[PDB]
Scaffold this active site. Structure first.
Site, mmCIF file in Angstrom:
data_model
loop_
_atom_site.group_PDB
_atom_site.id
_atom_site.type_symbol
_atom_site.label_atom_id
_atom_site.label_comp_id
_atom_site.label_asym_id
_atom_site.label_seq_id
_atom_site.Cartn_x
_atom_site.Cartn_y
_atom_site.Cartn_z
ATOM 1 C CG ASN D 375 -0.241 0.169 2.515
ATOM 2 O OD1 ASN D 375 0.734 -0.519 2.813
ATOM 3 N ND2 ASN D 375 -0.725 1.108 3.316
ATOM 4 C CB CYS D 377 1.457 3.182 4.976
ATOM 5 S SG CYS D 377 0.381 4.635 4.979
ATOM 6 C CD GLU D 379 -0.187 -0.552 6.583
ATOM 7 O OE1 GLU D 379 0.430 0.375 6.022
ATOM 8 O OE2 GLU D 379 -1.432 -0.598 6.650
#
Ligand SMILES: Nc1ncnc2c1ncn2[C@@H]1O[C@H](COP(=O)(O)OP(=O)(O)OP(=O)(O)O)[C@@H](O)[C@H]1O
Ligand SMILES: Nc1ncnc2c1ncn2[C@@H]1O[C@H](COP(=O)(O)OP(=O)(O)OP(=O)(O)O)[C@@H](O)[C@H]1O
Ligand SMILES: Cc1cn([C@H]2C[C@H](O)[C@@H](COP(=O)(O)OP(=O)(O)OP(=O)(O)O)O2)c(=O)[nH]c1=O
Ligand SMILES: [Mg+2]
Ligand SMILES: [Mg+2]
Ligand SMILES: [Mn+2]
Ligand SMILES: [Mn+2]
Ligand SMILES: [Mn+2]
Ligand SMILES: [Mn+2]
Lengths: 683, 289, 289, 683
Positions: D375, D377, D379
């Site tokens: 994604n 981020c 994670e």
């Protein structure tokens, strides 16, 4: 350097103070006896050629399967019986570099001019050998020229789409904006120029569901469309060309224009998307009276009235918009906006100018919709209904997105053969066939509009060539008289062919009953005014041809009332940029930019004289920049009175003249009934 | 109409020699023949010597005689790039590729070389001839400056670009490409300042300045052909270098608002791989006909 | 023994005003009295004038007469900073805080202000009096330049520093601190060059040069007092600024190798409060743990 | 300067050589005595408050209508009975500036912390008053924190979606690219961060309909996506954030990376589009052995094998690709590519690094698909299936697009309450409710994958805060022992809650039977290795809580075999940007960057010490940059062995260390089993 290149450059080497135009002819001979005949691929007979082109995925086998091989052989023999010769080197060069079919590695020439014409004619006829021969005779005589997409791609397996221009209406929603971007990429992939009306999109600083000052305006959508057209660039061959049209009463109209300023920042500047401005008569009236005008926020107007700002008449609703407190607006100076338009056109040739009221005062399909924008060449002016592209898993309300097929009459060849009627009817049939066989699976509104409107565009080329080769000054009243008579004849025979097609198919275009064709209003000026030539020279030019009178127009009006019209739109005069070279014709109805044009190809330079240029007609081939733009406006208005769609009208300006002169030309064009203005090219 | 725009482009192109690590060039340098190494050294010294004249005299003398605070600032910035950035960059390339004794000998040779000296002194002569408050002499010097920036450097740039386009001497080739990119904008800018002077002249004076520019170009061009054969015949490249000189001569002329002098030619693909109308208000009665 | 380290320091200090966003000062500016805004505009305008002449004239002319390519590179870089960076930064500040008419008025005010014209006349006169190969005229101009760098700027610098120290106009103040950081090293460098020339003289000649330096300082000082009163009386700070300029006069003298001339005084503590990555290749042992 | 801001800035003023941390508490009081209470709208009773909020379109009627007013009042009373006080000024400031509901004029405060918590609890419980009170006790004890979307928008009518992490698969077609652009715009409109996999897209210079050198590559698609994300920027509130992931064996990988270089031109660099690189084990093996690698043209591989390059295992496919003449490839140096990655991460922190085999060797749903990308981020690591978006009026083949549900445990608050099990189960229930109540009508694959996979992300935060307040260094083996035990218990109770939900509802996630949960492989390391603390200090920390043993894990494995698992994915550790302030916690499981952070709001300065920072634990609150990145990698791997998805793992580097050190950290992360590397923040 090649021998033909030297022979073509020998034109400018003057002999006895005169240009060596005849050397050009020699060049063509060289170009054929040293390059074309050696680089052509010859087969034992036509059967082997057709088989090789079919199995090697050069030709579609479906259109060739409608004819027995004897019929195809007869069509090809009819094409080659004319013994067509290119009179100039550049005509043959342009055909064999841009339109002749080559091998996969582009090392050899598979298609001659006669082969290409025969294939296009066989595609047009759709199984009719006699019709195929008629098309062959029409194109080999160069009376009619299918547009570059149609001429280049007809009957080819690796072809794109035969439609040149597409016009999209973009509704004010993220779903509609994304769908417009997708459709623009799809149509640029197909090779067509895409025009998008951004007037329905709400301006910058509008509310997206009760959170205010949230919209990016039309400039963000412009950047998205610019990137989409950059990405979809015909597989890297031709740069993706798009057009954005905005109403001059849109609040973003300045920012819109600021996309084309040479000092614009990168976050605002848009470079691959042409811009057009739609000017209602209200804006010109406000500028004339020097009264400060108001640009409007489309979303506030839509909320208050339930309709888009460009969906209704500004001439009657502008005061209601201004006096309505629930409508948001900004004060502008209409004269300052006009001066900004003139400055922008001087600097970059943008925006396109569309005089909305000039388009809609003679528009025959105002019941379907008013014409709110034009195409990338600013000559297509048709009714369009915006589409409601909804969320996924929801049915979309498919509107009408404009799309027409282009085809140009060669005025010199049409009048030399005294065949205005036959050429117009055959061209109308070919354009109808191109529309019928067009099916675009990724543009739903375009597909629906093609199926319903059945709109075609029949243009004209070699107006200035015909006038100069007949000793008529392009700015003279005799030239305007000729244009009036010739284009009245073209309109008459186009309407007659449309009505005949409607009769033979038993169907008209959608919503024809509400059109001015059905009510007979369209024929008013044709049943009361005589458009026969007022000058003896023009009448002699039209000798041997039956010029329609008011009685013929009355009979045609009765015929249309009885049978209807198959095509919502029939005539549109495209620029006809590169295909005019092959036809040995001046570009469109515009006057020539230069008598002899020097173009650089590869490391060589070539000179193309205007068709028929010589010592006796040197001054009749007056350059456009040296001409009075007011008389060119008069000519374009005279032609436009007989053209249902618009004309790509390029303004040819000198560097000495100011933006005030450009504004005066624009206002005279608006006064004379000019529908659209294409370009402001400065010498 | 243009100085603030050029200011922006100049300052955003700022760079320093230390940014490019040079040592990895020794991995391709060792594989060149003696003639290739000799030509490279001689070309490099030629560029170095000419660029020093531009830093010490050419840019500062033009900055001195041009009126306008913003123009003086841009010109100062360009002079800084010559002296503080370009000169250090050329020195760095040399120190990486040759030992101290070899550098001293190459510079001794190129300092005595007839074709390098001819062009260096022709340019310097025009800078020394500028007279206070005489825009004609300033224009002539600007023409000389544009010819150096946009034309004379290119018989030299050819070779590093030729290697750079082949994957050889990539670190020094990157440096040369940055230098060349600065000289290009210098040439365009000084060209606009020259056109400003040219446009203030009578028609007879203009024709006279055109004759000056073409005559100067011819002298420099004929010497460039000799310079080119002298350096590049030993590595078989002179024909292609000559095409590159003419192509860049045409760019220099266009910078001065003049027509191209030479016919268009294609350039070596390896080297290629290395490389307002008057606003007048509406007066009313323009809406009536 | 020093040019290389000054070269490195100057180039590592390179900056542009656009690196600092100025819209954050909008409110603390709006909140100042009309007297305070007037003094602030005028102060920066006086600074702009000094940097204009230091960049256009002072630094380039000293560069012309000083021998050695590295010394010239440092002086050329300093010249660029003066007019391409420092003088321009003030316009960035003006364009943020003030309307065009106030900007136009303050530039008109510099042209007619008698103290600012006098100090420019005196400093630029000495720059333009430099004679080729005449080290004494060069020394005199270098003294003038040190006095501009290390003394004359400070009647101007006081006010941005005074605000910065109170947490006001801190973005403009950041620009000014960068300018001040540059001028401090410029004053030291030019001071060292001046000392070189002074140290070549007889004792008798040295005595005359000290007289020149002290007479010039006193003349500039007396003019600066009147300038300071003219600007600062309306904001109540003239006496404080006077102490600051005397402090900096001593620093200018020290940069020239001379003893301090004014007695030490307590400076406003507010003003005192106002003061690519390296690449290694991957070894085969870095893939195992 | 306001009084609370002075009291906050008094922290840095040192008294007796110590920071005045306690002064921060006083600031909070001031921030509530002077500002919050004055600008908080008060009502005569909660009924009036709820009526005003519902009527003025602040809240939703549906979730409040599920309870009687007595139950809602009881939930609010339970929230207010805690008498919760923000321990630091920044906690209250961040809540009342970012999450507290304000009037339309943004000058008054409608929601306190207790009001927002009660509303979120009532939304979570979906009609259960006791469950709502349990959620209120969970959030007012600050044991669990719903993500910023859920916490901010739950129960609000004027809101975005509760999910803000979206992963899209883009198929190699113009229709799929346009649909991806549209879906990215729609999800950014909803307020979500969108990640797109571009590995299936064919590289630059590939064939489109058998015409050569036609594709623009993934860089043109990145430009389109960057424009789309710039346009869709949450109605002009936050900058549109998007991520693009490319496999390192894609040929465009250099040009991809070149989009983040400072020297890149305007037509190359993308500014609002984050980039991540997926690195299979084959690339690391090639770099380790210094063998020259090959970057492949995806379309040639697809034509040869019928599958996309990123859809097959490169470890077994690389040699076949190289030896296949019909697969087009380019020679590269993998060590040079690694050095380029390290240099780019030093300059800008990009790209994100995904170790494909590290993710997929423990992926439980490889049968559905292997995790091909992460994604925004870095994670979220889930199986995704690409969708085949066809032309108009043609049925699309809808695949699976990842969208997991975020929520973070506060490790300090959870462990001091000895409520790992209850907090994990309640957080799982809330995440399940939010996933079930999410319905996106413009992202078909996102909606389908949300309905089918039922994937949630349960994260943790305040790891470093908890360790520092307990006298444990973040790099100490005791800290890793605690992380191992705590996250093994979190995984145990998350799996238990998922199986309990599956048993209650009678349904598992789609294609669960093929997962390693169904086969029992997932529990292998849990039924053989005991994860009880090896240090007495950590065991005393876990005192009062039952630590699951191998027998408990065997029982859980049998329970999952009998009943299944409701969620395909349960745990993912998000960065937890601003919610860590409100919870007075350190961000994510990352070590703290600064002990006291200085921020500038408006024209004022503010100081936030790390939670629980004092003189005694000043040394234990070691800054992340001062820490050894190898030990941080060890801790993150220790946590990752109990997390099914990835962990947002930011590298914290000093300016002194070079790209060799960055590459060494990346290679040690790959060796230690790190799935993703988020950022390279240089001090
Ligand atoms: N201007 C031209 N346009 C088109 N084709 C040409 C042209 N000039 C030559 N060709 C082609 O090259 C051939 C060369 O023949 P050319 O025109 O010299 O005369 P020819 O051999 O007497 O025969 P013919 O004129 O009857 O074809 C032509 O037959 C024709 O196919
Ligand atoms: N640190 C804090 N965090 C959150 N709210 C606070 C804080 N300090 C004060 N408040 C708010 O201000 C009110 C006043 O609290 P104060 O410290 O004066 O005493 P109290 O006994 O808690 O008061 P009250 O009668 O309001 O319960 C609290 O009830 C609360 O609403
Ligand atoms: C989502 C979004 C919309 N817009 C603009 C462009 C569209 O023409 C316009 C309409 O967006 P819509 O898609 O119609 O948004 P909406 O339907 O949720 O809001 P409303 O009910 O008011 O119609 O908003 C932006 O400028 N930026 C954005 O990010
Ligand atoms: Mg809408
Ligand atoms: Mg496809
Ligand atoms: Mn240089
Ligand atoms: Mn230069
Ligand atoms: Mn300065
Ligand atoms: Mn200085």
């Amino acid at each position: 350097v090649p021998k033909w290149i030297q022979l073509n450059n020998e034109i400018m080497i003057q002999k006895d103070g005169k240009f060596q135009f005849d050397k050009d002819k020699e060049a063509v001979h060289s170009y054929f006896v040293d390059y074309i005949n050696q680089n052509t691929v010859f087969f034992h007979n036509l059967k082997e050629k057709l088989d090789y082109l079919v199995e090697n995925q050069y030709y579609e086998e479906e259109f060739l399967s409608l004819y027995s091989f004897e019929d195809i052989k007869e069509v090809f023999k009819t094409a080659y019986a004319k013994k067509f010769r290119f009179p100039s080197f550049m005509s043959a060069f342009k055909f064999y570099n841009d339109y002749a079919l080559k091998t996969n590695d582009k090392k050899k020439i598979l298609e001659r001019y006669e082969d290409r014409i025969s294939i296009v004619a066989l595609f047009f006829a759709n199984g009719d050998t006699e019709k195929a021969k008629e098309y062959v005779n029409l194109m080999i005589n160069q009376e009619y020229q299918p547009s570059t997409p149609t001429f280049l791609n007809a009957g080819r397996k690796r072809r794109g789409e035969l439609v040149s221009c597409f016009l999209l209406e973009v509704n004010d929603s993220l779903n509609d904006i994304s769908r417009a971007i997708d459709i623009s990429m799809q149509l640029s992939k197909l090779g067509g120029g895409v025009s998008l009306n951004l007037s329905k999109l709400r301006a910058k600083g509008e509310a997206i569901k009760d959170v205010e000052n949230a919209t990016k305006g039309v400039v963000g959508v412009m950047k998205l469309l610019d990137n989409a057209f950059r990405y979809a660039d015909q597989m890297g061959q031709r740069q993706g060309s798009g057009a954005a049209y905005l109403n001059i009463f849109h609040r973003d109209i300045n920012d819109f224009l600021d996309t084309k300023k040479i000092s614009a920042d990168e976050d605002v500047r848009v470079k691959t998307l042409s811009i057009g401005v739609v000017i209602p008569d209200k804006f010109v009236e406000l500028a004339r009276e020097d009264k400060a005008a108001y640009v409007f926020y489309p979303h506030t107007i839509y909320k208050e009235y339930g309709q888009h700002m460009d969906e209704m008449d500004m001439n009657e609703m502008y005061d209601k918009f201004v006096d309505n407190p629930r409508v948001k607006k900004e004060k502008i100076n209409p004269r300052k906006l006009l001066e900004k338009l003139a400055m922008l056109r001087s600097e970059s040739g943008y925006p396109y100018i569309m005089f909305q009221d000039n388009v809609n005062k003679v528009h025959a399909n105002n019941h379907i919709s008013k014409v709110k924008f034009s195409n990338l060449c600013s000559e297509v002016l048709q009714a369009s209904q915006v589409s409601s592209y909804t969320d996924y898993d929801e049915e979309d309300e498919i509107g009408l997105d404009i799309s027409c097929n282009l085809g140009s009459l060669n005025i010199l060849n049409v009048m030399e053969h005294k065949s205005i009627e036959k050429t117009v009817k055959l061209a109308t049939d070919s354009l109808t066939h191109v529309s019928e066989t067009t099916d675009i699976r990724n543009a739903p509104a375009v597909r629906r509009a093609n199926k319903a409107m059945k709109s075609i565009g029949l243009g004209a080329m070699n107006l200035h060539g015909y006038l100069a080769q007949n000793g008529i000054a392009y700015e003279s009243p005799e030239a305007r008289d000729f244009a009036n008579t010739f284009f009245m004849m073209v309109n008459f025979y186009s309407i007659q062919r449309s009505a005949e097609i409607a009769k033979e198919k038993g169907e008209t275009f959608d919503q024809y009953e509400g059109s001015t064709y059905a009510t007979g209003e369209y024929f008013d000026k044709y049943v009361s005014t005589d458009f026969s030539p007022k000058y003896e020279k023009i009448a002699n030019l039209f000798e041997g041809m039956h010029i329609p009178t008011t009685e013929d127009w009355k009979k045609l009006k009765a015929f249309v009332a009885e049978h209807g019209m198959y095509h919502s739109y029939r005539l549109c005069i495209a620029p006809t940029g590169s295909i005019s070279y092959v036809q040995s014709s001046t570009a469109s109805v515009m006057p020539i930019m230069e008598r002899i044009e020097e173009r650089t190809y590869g490391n060589s330079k070539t000179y193309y004289p205007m068709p028929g240029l010589a010592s006796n007609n040197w001054f009749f081939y007056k350059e456009a920049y040296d001409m009075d733009m007011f008389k060119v406006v008069d000519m374009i208005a005279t032609i436009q009175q007989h053209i249902d769609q618009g004309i790509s009208f390029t303004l040819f300006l000198k560097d000495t003249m100011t933006t005030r002169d450009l504004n005066r030309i624009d206002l005279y064009a608006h006064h004379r009934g000019i529908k659209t203005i294409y370009y402001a090219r400065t010498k | 109409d243009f100085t603030q725009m050029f200011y922006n482009q100049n300052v955003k192109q700022f760079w320093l020699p230390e940014e490019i690590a040079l040592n990895g060039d020794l991995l391709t340098w060792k594989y060149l023949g003696k003639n290739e190494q000799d030509t490279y050294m001689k070309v490099l010294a030629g560029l170095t010597l000419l660029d020093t004249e531009q830093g010490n005299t050419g840019m500062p003398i033009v900055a001195e005689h041009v009126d306008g605070h913003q123009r003086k600032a841009v010109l100062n910035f360009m002079a800084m790039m010559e002296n503080a950035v370009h000169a250090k960059s050329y020195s760095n390339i040399f120190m990486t590729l040759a030992p101290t004794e070899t550098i001293n000998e190459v510079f001794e040779w190129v300092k005595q070389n007839k074709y390098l000296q001819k062009k260096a002194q022709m340019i310097v002569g025009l800078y020394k001839a500028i007279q206070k408050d005489d825009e004609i002499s300033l224009f002539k010097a600007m023409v000389a400056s544009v010819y150096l920036e946009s034309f004379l450097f290119y018989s030299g740039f050819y070779y590093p670009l030729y290697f750079y386009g082949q994957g050889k001497l990539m670190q020094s080739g990157e440096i040369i490409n940055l230098i060349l990119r600065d000289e290009a904008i210098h040439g365009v800018y000084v060209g606009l300042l020259a056109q400003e002077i040219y446009n203030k002249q009578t028609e007879e004076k203009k024709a006279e300045l055109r004759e000056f520019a073409i005559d100067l170009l011819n002298q420099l061009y004929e010497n460039e052909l000799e310079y080119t054969e002298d350096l590049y015949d030993q590595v078989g490249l002179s024909h292609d270098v000559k095409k590159f000189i003419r192509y860049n001569a045409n760019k220099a002329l266009m910078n001065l608002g003049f027509d191209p002098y030479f016919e268009e030619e294609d350039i070596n693909p390896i080297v290629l791989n290395g490389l307002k109308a008057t606003v007048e208000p509406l007066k009313d009665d323009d809406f009536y006909f």
